[PDB]
Design a protein around this ligand. Structure first.
Ligand SMILES: Nc1ncnc2c1ncn2[C@@H]1O[C@H](COP(=O)(O)O)[C@@H](O)[C@H]1O
Ligand SMILES: [Cl-]
Ligand SMILES: [Cl-]
Lengths: 195, 196
């Protein structure tokens, strides 16, 4: 699996809240047949399992503490190993959270052939999030809250983006257009590495 | 108003390793004393379930397995305490704080605990209890290695904090190796000794 997992299609896709990443991942899954993974879903599944390891993770999460990179990676490797054979490739959504976690992924699993960055302005992200918002607070309040959320995304993503731009595996996609036009751009990037 | 109210209310921190019996003791303390039991885990769970816009920032963080900033947890804590003030006899803050600066911040922003309870239990006893509660489908060696990591994480979180509150307030170490009913007895003794 070491050699199999390594010599196989791995795409990271990143983007802030309101970038359209969720919907585009579904479209990509539908088109390409990729295995769509994310740490949040992997953590949720593990927590539902009653394993001793899920109890460790829960001890940590209940303190608001960081879940070590190595546990997250163990969960990815297992999901990836479970999907090999019947896979057209791996779409890892929202990963990595930090450069060192990405580096460790590279060493222990495989280097992604493509890191897609869903590039989008704060204003657009904010409008999409406002539209979906269920709060009945004043819009001013809701917008300040959304702003804080974008600001924290921007601070986590910057060094990651920089790392992959420095390694030249990053494709920036203009996530501002129609869903139709964004998807085309995504497929153009994917087809350009994997053909 | 709330500021001086929060500063003068009963604040007890209770710290204990997994398998120490802390959870079940807290439920009994709440029932007996009419305290409000607060924990980070439960506060986080509740914020997330609220579906508030503010909650989505925490959801982003936790989906990466990233650390939730202390300010966010403190905010949620303060809000829980303000909401319970006037229909509670005191706060039992369970497994908090996780580091010293976070405790110092609590002290400045909310109030100083009058009592820190530490539920002392050996690693061997915590390990054995946690095996008794295990649903592991893995061999006992693998299973016990993961339990050892759970204790390691507890010791990391607890040692600096316990050492700090020893210097600052009343800290009572309870022998949690006993029966749960004896542990309850000792807890009640500790609490009664402080609140008069
Ligand atoms: N909360 C979630 N976050 C990220 N991915 C999810 C989530 N729930 C399901 N998925 C997966 O991501 C895509 C969208 O989710 P769904 O269509 O609800 O299954 C699917 O391809 C799922 O495999
Ligand atoms: Cl959202
Ligand atoms: Cl010991």
């Amino acid at each position: 699996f070491m050699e199999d997992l390594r010599k196989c299609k791995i795409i990271f896709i990143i983007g802030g809240p309101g970038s359209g990443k969720g919907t585009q991942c579904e479209k990509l899954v539908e088109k390409y047949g990729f295995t769509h993974l994310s740490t949040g879903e992997l953590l949720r599944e593990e927590l539902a399992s009653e394993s001793e390891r899920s109890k460790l993770i829960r001890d940590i999460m209940e303190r608001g503490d960081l879940v070590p990179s190595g546990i997250v990676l163990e969960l990815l490797k297992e999901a990836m190993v479970a999907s090999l054979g019947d896979t057209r490739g791996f779409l890892i959504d929202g990963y990595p959270r930090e450069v060192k976690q990405g580096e460790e992924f590279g060493r222990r699993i495989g280097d992604p052939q493509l890191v897609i960055c869903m590039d989008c302005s704060a204003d657009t992200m904010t409008n999409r999030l406002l539209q979906m918002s269920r709060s009945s607070l004043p819009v001013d309040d809701t917008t300040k809250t959304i702003a804080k959320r974008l600001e924290a995304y921007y601070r986590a993503s910057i060094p990651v983006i920089a790392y992959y731009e420095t390694k030249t595996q990053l494709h920036k996609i203009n996530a501002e257009g129609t869903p139709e036009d964004v998807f085309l751009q995504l497929c153009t990037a994917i087809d350009s590495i994997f053909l």
